[PDB]
Structures are given as structure tokens and as C-alpha cells.
Symmetry: D2
């Protein structure tokens, strides 16, 4: 099931969580960068080797092994960072790991693995429906030695971070000899390149997410980068984005299971601390049944997350397409519902700064959109099902 | 069936909304945006004042109060629906919460002195008020849990307790508080007027809703009551009458929120359809993706259902009073917030990432509806009351 | 609101229900025709004038007036018949009333109004998706004096009834000079015409519905009818079906409100007669909340039914298109849910012959399909909404 | 992780299903159809017998019982899923309810004489049995309500009471009943073997499920117990042990139903996709209407969820026993029937009018799943148990 290394590392992560991270929550909870405790915590994690756990080729962990670890990190908003496991940097690391040239890795992959710099992924554009990636019009043109980039991007997570020195950008390479689906490319763009302008931060229900901060509109005004900044090859844009978003999708879902287990904990502590109409709240059967329904949902999605991870292990993330889609739909909406019941049990306190539930709700709502909206994944599953259904009849 | 006056005033409100209020939205929003989460800005820009004055001149003012407006509850429901389409519209006609409820409490139960002193300034929009019932340390959905102490020595009352979620306390104009506390007796609760500048009243901190502080109506505060002494004549109606008065005020409170919510929904669906026609994904406009189409249709169905149920309730209040319409108010209080919540959430989804952003009012709209499943009584509590009432009526008929 | 006549007639229907119909339920409940009591009951209704109430031009009732009456009939499975208000005969009467020639009315409309014969509507075909009416391929061809009909029809309700002497049939009149949407016609076909063959009955969850009996596959094998049997004109098929199904749709929904009010009654009687875990069942809060949710749903749909009726009164059934669609979607699924909770409260008894809930569930499930499936109505509403939404911006 | 034997036997079952069982479905159905609602036909056509014999020869028999099959619960779950795709498949491998539960009750608690007399013939498929717990006159979901009287005079027991929903009683082979009654004592319930031919046992009437009588497994009966006398040695295990034994049997009962339901669902989704490709409406195949597409996708998601949760539960039973897996069995008992119910209902909708007709197995499939939200314990009861267990585990960890 789990590997022996996987079991040991999980045990180590749990200890670290209980003994260092969680005791630091109060303070960290109570400007687009991170307080010094985050740094001391990172250093400690490095020493005990709890670092880059998300990357098999470095961690020596299977995706099954990591799922249980990632679940644990999901119980705390700054946990993934401490182990260098946070988005959008994990996906960006994977992109370079799988497709980067040797020069590209020496320059960017190494610093990222070290936690020296951060990065942002730039795909979504305000002026076009970006859920259909073929709509992307951010222009990339080629003169002999270099590429010129022009366009608008938004929702770039993490751009506010002064350490964010590098951007991975998806654009159109208009080419008349290639087909409609081979019209896009991925290119490295250093944040300090002339013509790169960060315009404004974007809120999520009036959170700005300063801590991971944040989410930005970035314009690309005549930016020139060396041809050697292109990733893999011209026309390979969609391929690379599929390569990175597969893990991206699954890491978010693993974390969500931990999020949910935290919500249900908060829900039960609360339902026992409050007397209304001469009964503790858990004695009102409707509240009881929310607790129960939440337990059922968590088990279902943890299992479906594990199934997906196990597919990746044995098929690679392309071959696990269907299972990743399934968990990407299931997880955020189920956990969203759990958080919302938890908020309801907490009364007015549920929407307040006094609990982490309102934040938790914002995170889960957004995951029905980020890394691809539910509806898009559902259509992909329907297509895939109808193919498999056709196969079994041949 | 609407009244003739009701029809005329509705027409007037529509012609004010289109011609004055809505064209001011762009600017008022730019003000709301810059001041959200401000430590110190809890009031309104001058346009709100100019707008209020204009409304006074045309008589569009205090429309929510029959004994002043000469309007039925049915008449107002349609009007309030229209105000719901803009976050500052109810204020312009002096129809905003928590002030409408507080005014009604004084109108029905206030002594002549109490009215002359507080009801009058509120009716002019000179001051504002806040209602103080909810307490952090006890489950306040069961009102009998309220422990905020009220004790009596001859000429006065002494008040000690904690209150929170007091809406509007941050606005400097908020000079008066209506408070619910325990008056221990044999053989438990009272409502009392407390001026905000009374020694011992301390405003502790603002409270956020998904990280919105609601500065514009601002906002929602924890208030402590530390040995505050008020005149015995500040008591409303009588000792032991707390629950009665809160029922008296929250009935309309509940229904006014629902009426506004119908307008909120209609606005979401408009935003949803404009958007669904402006975006091409996978070689179609988004409304051509049948799943989106069916959210539009499901929305229309839900609005019609809840508008009618709002009207049914209003019509009950007209012919039964708000005590006799208990059941119908409960029904709409449950139905409306959750339905419109769902409509807003689909509208957000249709808008993509923009739907949670500051570029649309949907994220705010969602927060408002979410909070209405809690404020003025949580769904679960109203459901239980309906079940009890249903089983009584069910017993009656057999 | 209601008219004075409407109020009086409702009062009369309630009395009749309580005093004659309902006391007969036991027996009628405890072969495709009806027992003699049904006949004696019909005769009594005629004498007191409680007959054809569904038809304004005869009853002098508004659609609002009838909605409340139809609601009352919905509380008993044989009630609509007693007042001559049952489908498919009401729709068939309306079709002749609005579009029949004088000869056609003298021959068919009169007997039906009298309750002497019954009729069936034949639109749905097994071999094509009949929810898109343009798919209908049942052939209608013309030689000089007469029409020849060839095709298959199924789900013809009431065909088993020995009194069913007449069929209203929707077929294709292939005509090269008309457009795709003008290719269909409606034609009267007497059941005893050579070439008309009733093939087999169809069950609904293994009910055959003998009482209204039933639902049949009918084949049309070279049937010849006089040209004067055509309704209104060649090419007008869709128009006539819209003309008849509008009321059809709304009458079914009115009846459903009464059905629901019966289910909730059964649910509450039961929830008070049963002690489980030391409490009556209504004291288990989850059961309480089903009762409450059911009350809420009934009020919503009764109101939406009334809104629809009131539109018909003031706009005609074409102009009320949108409101009829809205209630057609809302009603059957909501009431379906109420019946299903009622079944759950009744335990094993809920699915049994000992209650009318299992039948009630079958009726409501089927109304999500008959007179047009939910999905089709939802699409129509979306189209209409987007038009109205466009209007308000001009 | 499956065992090697488990893998081999699964392969065999698949190769029997495709080659013998499924090709017999057409005919067996024609038999089911003609005999549904028959007053007097409660047994099975001869092909079922030939099929049973063939299975015996290849060893595909009693697969549900580890101590005989040598299979783990995980191993069987996959097998039972396969049986679920055909209404007569579990019988062919002697894996049908209520007989599997009754066999387990004797296997775990039966005395040597009891086994030799009843367990043996059942294991051969010579006789059948029925379980008698539910009583019409009391809410039987709370087992302590059972009033069916059992009294003791020296050498024997006297039984008086009403029972209903006794599945299979109509089949002539049903020679034995396992009965739960009250043994009044201080300081309440017992299980007792009752042969069907005992004087005083009267089968009253069959019960329908949406007007299906279930003749094939036939069927479900009300049985009265009018002064029936049995030997004291007919008691199972001991006086006072009723609840224990019912828990002992219903644990597997619950889980076997769920495993079969996964196969039921997979069959619905297959029917749904074949249909959605065979019908053109509004110029598209039905799967091209995005709403239908999303029901297909939602179905796939639900199946994977419940299969995994079934496997999790099975794996618990393997490592904890069925008492120690209480929680996980409860979870799957709630989750499975309602999810698959929804899948079947969407499949019906996709099929149009045909979906409620005798031309498809969907209407039957719906009835089966609906009944599983009641049988072996209603959802609501299992939900409450989960809540209680969750709050205990939640207390443990803190
Ligand atoms: C907190 C947050 C962080 C983000 N971080 C990043 C980032 O780091 N990098 C980045 O490139 N982007 C990022 N995004 C944005 C993002 O991923 C997109 O918003 C998402 O992919 C949808 O793009 P869109 O806003 O253009 O929606 P649109 O393309 O305009 O579509 C909007 C809605 O249409 C519907 N829809 C689309 N197609 C179909 C269909 N076939 N059938 C039925 N319905 C359909 C969906 O409901 C969809 O949400 C982030 C977004 C949020 C909220
Ligand atoms: C934006 C906002 C503005 C507000 N403004 C005001 C104001 O102006 N004045 C004021 O006095 N208060 C105000 N409040 C707060 C308020 O009304 C309460 O939060 C709410 O009514 C319940 O109080 P509580 O937090 O104590 O919930 P609790 O009483 O602790 O109960 C918590 C949860 O238990 C559940 N529950 C309770 N009883 C039952 C039952 N019998 N059966 C099943 N479930 C049950 C409910 O789901 C409930 O939400 C405001 C709140 C918000 C969010
Ligand atoms: C109890 C009962 C009585 C009946 N009585 C009559 C009668 O008296 N006369 C008569 O002519 N018919 C009658 N019918 C049948 C009937 O009305 C049809 O079955 C219904 O119109 C659908 O036709 P169909 O069976 O061909 O479904 P299909 O056309 O093959 O379509 C099946 C399913 O496709 C889906 N669908 C269709 N279009 C869309 C879309 N645009 N988008 C998304 N989903 C879509 C729906 O879910 C639909 O149900 C009766 C049916 C029942 C169950
Ligand atoms: C097809 C079929 C086959 C069957 N076969 C058998 C058999 O072979 N042997 C046998 O002994 N029985 C059998 N039964 C019947 C059976 O199991 C019962 O019907 C069921 O377990 C409950 O019994 P009841 O009808 O008395 O429901 P009740 O006990 O009267 O309770 C009714 C409803 O109340 C609700 N409820 C109960 N407790 C609570 C609570 N604490 N909180 C909230 N809600 C609550 C539930 O929703 C429940 O369904 C069969 C039933 C069917 C439909």
C-alpha cells in the first residue's frame, strides 16, 4: 500500500507538525512576504530532510506516499511552505524538471528547490474565456535571437512576493504551418525584465491572500527574452500545461482532505461547547447528521484521492487523466459543503476572524475554478467514459 | 393586488432608481472599494446625502412604515424588491436595517417621551441606531440563554454584559442602542434604550464576514456594557416583555430582508446572462452550453417562487398582523436566503475567476445571502417552528 | 382574486368530495373499465352541475377558479373522472373546441362532453426520440378523398378502455413546398377503423394503470380516413399540440398540489402513530424538518400554479408559455420528493399496497416525462429568459 | 490488495457470467415477466437449476462464506459486484439473500445438531429460508420494540406474534424460518429456529414494492405465528442474545447488498450510454446535450466513490471482524443505495418513457435501490449511529 520510507516520513511530518508548526499557528495568524518564524521553520525542516517531499525524483516517495503527507499539510495554512510544497511553485518546479534544458534547470530549478526564489504561473487572461486554453491570445513573436511578448495576464498567484523572480508564461506562437491545437508555447520570463508590469492585486471575497501573496494582474508590454527561454519546443504549450496541472490538480485535492478533517474537528468541538434549547448542539439531530454526512464525505474523497495517486504511480500523470479529473470535481465541492455546515454550527462566529472557517470556505470555492472549473472536468469525464464504454463493446 | 398609491409610489421609485441612484453606483462603489477594511472609515460619501435630500423632497422616505407611508406590506414588498438591486438604495429612502426595526420597536411600544427623543430624529435620518441582542459567550439563537444583566435601583437601571454583531455601531451617527437583557424575577427579559455615549459603553472591535468589514453600512461590532446606568424611563413597555418586543421587531425585519433579496437575485441573474453571452468557450457562447442554460432557467424558477412566497407573507401581515403571520414569515425566512445564495453562486461560477473578484458585486452578494441564513434567526430554528406550527394545524383539521 | 362563481363551485366540490367521493374510495380501491359506483357518482355530479369544470366556455370558470378546484380533485385518484375532468380527454376536448369544424364537434366533441365515449392522444413513437416533435415519422399521405396513415405509436393513455372510440393522431405530411417546421398534421382516427391494431399495454414500475386504463402501443397499418378528419389544416400539427398541451401541462400540476397535500397528511398521521427510540417519529428532528420542507414546497408550487393560471386568463395559453413551462418543471419533482420522504416515514409500508404513496410516487415520476421532459422545458425557459433579458436592455 | 485465489475465482466468475448466465438472461426475464404478480408462482425455471449444477461442478458455490470459499471479504466484494449485474446471478452461485445471512447465523452460533439439520441442506441449495424480524404493529427500526412473544414450558417454546416483509417465504423450498422475538426476563430478545410446516404458522399475504411482487425471489410475506410450539433446542445460542445475533448476521447482510449495488450501478450507466448514443433529439445525439453528458460523468464519479468505500469496509471486516467494522459498514450502507438510486433515476430519464417500462430493467433496478434505504436498517438510523461513533472517536483523539 504505502512504502516503508513513506510511513517513516509521514511519522516525521506528524511529529514536526505537532511540535513546531502547529504551536506557531497562533503567532503566524496574529506586505506580501512571510514573518521570520516561517524562515526558522523552513531551516529546521531542511536539516531533518523534510523538504521537497512532493517530488519523487528527489524525495524518493511515491504519489500514494505523498498523498497522506499532503493531507497532513492541509490542516495548516502555512504548513506546505515549511516543507517547500506550496503552489504555484511545485507545479513550476515539475515543469522545469520534466521539460527544462540543462541551462534552464541550473538557472531556475536549483534556486527554487532551495527556496531562494519563488515563481508564478501565467496562463489566464482577463479578456478571453481562459477555461478553453485555445482562446489565449497573449502574443509571442520570434526574431532571430529572441522572443517578443505582448499581452495581459491575471490571477497570477504569488507575484506580490519580493522573492518571486521568475514567470512561466503561456502564449500564442502564431504559425501557419501548424494546426489549431499547436499554436501555443511556454516561456520563461524573469520578473525584472523591462516591459513586465504588475498592475494590481485581486481579492477573493475581499481576502487579498497576502501571506502566499497574492494574486495579480500582470501586463507584458514588449518584453524581450532570449530564444533559449522557450520550454521544450514551439507548439508544445498545451502539453506542458497538462504536464504541470495534473500534479497541481491532485496536490490541491490531497490538501483539501486535511482541510476537511480540520473543519469537522472544529464542528464537533463547537457542537459540544454550546447549549441551545436545553441540549448540546450535537443532540439536535440535524446537527448530528451534518457530522455524519461530513465523515462519509471525507472517507469517499480521501479514497478517491488515493486511487488517483495510485494511478499516477502506475500510469504516469497523462495515463491517470480520468482519475485526476474525477477527484478534481469531487473534492472541492464536497469539502466546500463541509466547511459551510461547520460555519453554520458556529453561528455568527463562523463567518468571523475568530475561526479559520471563512478562509477555508474561500479556498474551497476557488478550487472549483482554479486548475480548471468543475464543468470543464465533467465534460472531459463524460467524453472519456463514452470512449471506455465503447471499448468494452468491441 | 396592489393599491393605487402603491402603484404610483412604485413608479416613482423606479424613475428615481434609473435616473439618480443607479447612475451614482459607479462612484459610490469606488468609495466602498477604497474604504473596505479601513480602521477608521465607517460613514457615507456626500452623494448619499444629496440623494437622501432629493428623496425627501419627492416624498420617497420611510416607505417601510405603513402609519407614515400609507402603504400596505404588499405595496412595500414590490418597492423593497427594487431597493434590493443596489447596496445603497435602501439608505436613500431611509429603509435600511437595523434602523427600520428599531423605528418600529419605538413606534409600537415607545412611550411619548421615548418617541419625541428617539423615534423623531431617526425618522429624519439625523441619527442612527443599533440593535443589541446576540452575545458571544452563549448560543443566542435560543433567546432565553441571554445573560446580559439588567438590575434596578429605584430611579435607574444598571447594565452589565457582552454583546456582539451589533450592526452599524461604527458609524458616528449611531447615537442609540436598543438592548435585550435579563431582568431576574419571579415568576425574564427586557428591552432598554441605551445612548451610545453613556459612561461604561465600550465599542471593542469590528467583526468581518469572509474578510469584508462592511464599512459602508459600517459595520458589525462587539460592544461591552460595563456598569452602565440609564434612567428607569429608558425601559421599553415593561419588565418581562423582552421576547415579545424582539418578536415584534424581527417579524418585519425578517420580511424586509427577504424582499430585498428578490431584487438581489434578479440582479445576479442579469449579470449571469450578460456574461453568458459575452464569452465564447469551446466554439460557443456560454449560454449555448446546456448546463449553463439550465442554471439560468433554474434561477428564473427560483425567483418566481420566492417573490410569490414573499408576497403571500406580506399579504398575511396586512390581514393578520405580524404575530398572526408568524408561519408565513418563517417560511420565507428559510426559503429566500438559501435559494438566492445558490443563484449567486452559479452567477459567480459563470463569471470565472472574475466572480470572486472586486470587478463584480457577486462576491459581496454571496456574503450577504450567506449571512441571512444566520441573522434574524438561523434556518434550522425557523424550520423547527414551522414543523411545530404545521403539526398543530394538522391536528386542528382532523 | 377568485371569482364569486369560482368560490361557490369550490364549496360545492369540497362538500361532494367529503360526502360522496371520499367515502367511496375504500371500495373503488378494493379489465380496463370502471366499477358501477363511478357511474352513479358521475350521474350525481351531472345533476348538481359539477361537470366539465375544466372548460371556461362551458363552466364559466376562470383558470384561477379551476386551479383550486383541480387541487381538490388531486386528493383522490378517481375524483377528476367523476367531474369529467380527466386526462387525456380534457386535452382532446380542448383540441376539438378550439380547432374542430362544426361536423367534427357534432360527431366527437358532444359525446365526450357527455362522458359517453373516451379518447386517446397519439403523438409519441417508440423508434424516434419523441421529445423533439420534428422527429415524428408516422406517415400521413393524401389521395383525393381520403388520408392513408402508416406508423407506430406508443404510450397512448386510455386506449384499453372499451369506451375509447376516438384517437387524435399527430403525423408527418411530407410536403416539399413547406418548411421543416410545417411538416406535421393532426387527424381524427376512430379506434374501430380497419388497420388500427392495439398491440400491448405498458407498465410504470409494474403498475398497468387499469383503472384509467391503461397505456398502449398502437400500430397504424394502412388506415384510411375521410379528408374531413383532418384538424384545422395541413402543416398545423405543432400548433395544435401546443394548443392542447398547455392546459394539459397545467391541469396535471394543479392536481399534483392536491396529491402533495395528501402525502403530507399521510406523513403527519404516521409520524404521530409511531414510537421509535422512546420518541414519536415527529420528535426526531430530521423527520420534523421533512414535514417543514414539505409545507414550504407546497406553498411555493401552489403559488406558482396560480401565477400560471392567472397568466392564461389574461394572456391566453400561448402568451403564458413561459409560466406554464416553469410550473411544469417545478411541480412534479418537488412533489416527487415529498412523496419519497412520506414513503420513508412509513417504513416498509411506504412501498406497499397498504398506502397510496407508492402509486403517488409513480404518478409524479412520470410527470417529469409526460407532456414534455424536464430538460426540454428548462431549455425553453433558458431561451425565453435570454430574450426577456435582451429586451430590458434595448 | 486482492489474494491470488481471489483473482483466479474472479476470473472464473467473469468467464461463467459472459458464457452461461448472461446468455440466459433473455429467457429468464421472459419467465420473470410473465410470472410477475402471479397469485401462485413463487419459484424458478429449470435453467436456473441447470445453471446452479454447472456452478457446483466448477466450484463456484457459496463464495460468500470465507470458511468454505477460502476467500477474503475484499476478494468477495469484487465477485459480488459482478453478480450484481444480473438479477439471478447471486442465486446461481448460492449467494442470494436472505439465505446468506441465515447461513452465517447458523455457522457462527448454531449448535452441532442445528448445523447438521439446517446449515447443511442450505449449503447444498436443497432448501431455502427466511428471516423474520419486522412487525407491522410497531416501529421495527428500533429492535427493542419487537413484541412477538416467546414463552418457555420445560421441553419447548410457544410463539405468538405477527411478522411481515419476510423475504422468500412464498417459494415452496422455504422450509425454515429464523425468528426474533421477546423472551421476557430479569434483568429481552431471542432468536429461534421455526420450521415453516409447524402447526400454527400461517402465511397471510404477499406485499408489493411499487406494485412488483418479486415472484422470482419470491416474494415478501406477512406471516402470523399462532401458538406455534418448537423444541427448546431450536433456540439459537441463548436466551437474551437476540440483538447480538441480528447484529452478527446483518453486518454481512448490509455489506453484500452494497457490493451488489456497485454492479447494479455499472449496469445502469452502461444502459444510459448505449441509449444516449442511439437517440437523436434537436439535431444531436443525447450525449451531446451537456446536461446528459454531466449525468454520465456524475455517475462515474459516484460509482468509484462507493466501490472504494465498499472495499474499505470489506478490508475492515477482514482485519477487525464485522463487529469491529461497525462504523465502516454503516457508512457504506448509507452511501450506496441513495447514490445508485440517483444513477438509476438519471438512466430512466435518459430512456424517456421506456425508462419506466418493461422494456428495460431500470424500473426494477430503481425499486431495488429504493428498498435498500429501508431494508437492513433505514438511512436515518445508520446516520445516527455514525454520528455517535464519530463523536466518540472525536473525543478519543483530544
Ligand atoms: C484564487 C485563484 C487563484 C488563481 N491562480 C491562477 C494562476 O496562478 N495562474 C493562472 O493562469 N490562472 C489562475 N487563476 C484563474 C483560473 O484558473 C481561471 O479563472 C479558470 O481557469 C477559468 O478561467 P476564466 O476566469 O477565464 O473563466 P471562463 O473561461 O470565462 O469561463 C467561466 C465559466 O464558464 C463555465 N464553463 C466553461 N466551459 C464550459 C463548458 N464546456 N461547459 C459548461 N460550462 C463551461 C464554467 O463554469 C467557467 O468557470 C486563479 C483563479 C482564482 C479564483
Ligand atoms: C453580518 C451579520 C450581522 C448581524 N447583526 C446582528 C444585529 O444587528 N443584532 C443582533 O442581536 N445580532 C446580530 N447578528 C448575529 C446573529 O443573529 C446570530 O449569530 C444568530 O442569530 C445566532 O446566534 P449564534 O452565533 O449564537 O448561533 P448559536 O445560537 O451558537 O447556534 C449555532 C447554530 O446551531 C444551529 N441550531 C441552533 N438551534 C438549533 C435547533 N433547535 N435545531 C437544529 N439546529 C440548531 C443553527 O444552525 C445555528 O446557526 C449578526 C450576524 C451576522 C453574521
Ligand atoms: C405514464 C405515461 C403516460 C404517457 N401518455 C402519452 C400519451 O397519452 N400520448 C403521447 O403522445 N405520449 C405519451 N407518453 C410518452 C411521452 O410523452 C414521452 O415519453 C416524452 O415526451 C419523451 O418521449 P421519449 O420516450 O421518446 O423520450 P426521448 O425523446 O427519446 O428523450 C429521452 C430523454 O432525453 C432527454 N432530453 C431530450 N431532449 C433534451 C435536451 N434538449 N437537452 C437535455 N436533455 C434532453 C430527456 O431527459 C428525455 O426524457 C406517456 C409517458 C408515460 C411515462
Ligand atoms: C423489499 C423489502 C424486503 C424486506 N425484507 C425483510 C426481511 O427479509 N426480514 C425483515 O425482518 N424485515 C424485512 N423488511 C422490512 C424492514 O427492514 C423495515 O421496514 C425497516 O428496517 C424499518 O421497519 P419499519 O417499516 O417498521 O420502519 P419504522 O421503524 O416504522 O420507522 C419508519 C421511518 O422512521 C425513520 N426513523 C426511524 N428512527 C429514526 C431516528 N432515530 N432518527 C430519524 N428518523 C428515524 C426512518 O426513516 C424510518 O424508515 C423488508 C422491507 C422491504 C421494503
Amino acid at each position: 500500500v504505502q512504502t516503508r520510507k513513506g510511513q517513516e516520513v509521514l511519522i516525521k511530518v506528524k511529529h514536526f507538525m505537532k511540535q513546531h508548526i502547529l504551536p506557531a499557528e497562533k503567532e503566524v495568524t496574529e506586505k506580501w512576504g512571510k514573518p521570520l518564524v516561517i524562515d526558522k521553520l523552513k531551516e529546521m525542516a531542511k536539516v531533518e530532510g523534510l523538504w521537497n517531499l512532493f517530488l519523487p525524483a528527489v524525495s524518493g516517495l511515491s504519489h500514494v506516499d505523498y498523498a497522506l503527507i499532503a493531507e497532513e499539510t492541509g490542516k495548516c495554512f502555512f504548513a506546505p511552505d515549511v516543507f517547500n510544497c506550496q503552489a504555484p511553485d511545485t507545479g513550476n518546479m515539475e515543469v522545469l524538471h520534466l521539460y527544462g534544458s540543462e541551462e534552464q534547470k541550473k538557472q531556475w530549478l536549483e534556486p527554487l528547490l532551495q527556496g531562494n526564489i519563488t515563481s508564478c504561473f501565467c496562463m489566464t487572461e482577463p479578456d478571453v474565456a481562459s477555461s478553453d486554453a485555445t482562446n489565449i491570445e497573449c502574443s509571442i513573436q520570434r526574431d532571430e535571437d529572441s522572443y517578443v511578448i505582448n499581452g495581459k495576464k491575471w490571477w497570477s498567484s504569488g507575484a506580490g512576493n519580493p522573492k518571486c523572480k521568475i514567470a512561466i508564461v503561456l502564449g500564442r506562437t502564431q504559425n501557419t504551418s501548424l494546426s489549431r491545437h499547436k499554436q501555443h508555447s511556454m516561456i520563461l520570463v524573469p520578473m525584472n525584465t523591462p516591459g513586465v508590469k504588475i498592475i494590481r492585486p485581486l481579492s477573493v471575497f475581499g481576502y487579498t491572500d497576502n501571506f502566499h501573496g497574492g494574486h495579480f494582474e500582470i501586463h507584458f508590454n514588449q518584453v524581450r527574452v532570449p530564444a533559449t527561454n522557450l520550454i521544450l519546443g514551439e507548439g508544445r504549450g498545451f502539453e506542458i500545461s497538462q504536464g504541470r496541472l495534473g500534479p497541481g490538480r491532485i496536490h490541491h485535492c490531497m490538501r483539501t482532505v486535511g482541510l476537511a478533517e480540520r473543519a469537522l474537528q472544529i464542528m464537533c468541538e463547537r457542537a459540544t461547547q454550546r447549549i441551545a434549547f436545553k441540549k448540546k448542539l450535537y443532540a439536535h439531530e440535524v446537527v448530528a447528521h451534518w457530522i455524519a454526512e461530513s465523515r462519509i464525505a471525507i472517507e469517499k474523497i480521501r479514497l478517491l484521492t488515493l486511487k488517483a495517486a495510485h494511478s499516477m504511480d502506475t500510469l504516469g500523470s497523462a495515463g491517470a487523466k480520468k482519475e485526476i479529473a474525477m477527484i478534481k470535481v469531487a473534492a472541492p465541492r464536497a469539502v466546500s459543503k463541509i466547511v459551510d455546515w461547520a460555519i453554520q454550527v458556529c453561528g455568527g462566529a463562523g463567518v468571523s476572524q475568530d475561526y479559520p472557517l471563512a478562509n477555508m470556505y474561500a479556498i474551497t470555492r476557488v478550487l472549483r475554478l482554479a486548475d480548471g472549473p468543475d464543468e470543464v472536468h465533467l465534460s472531459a469525464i463524460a467524453t472519456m467514459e463514452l470512449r471506455d464504454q465503447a471499448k468494452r463493446l468491441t
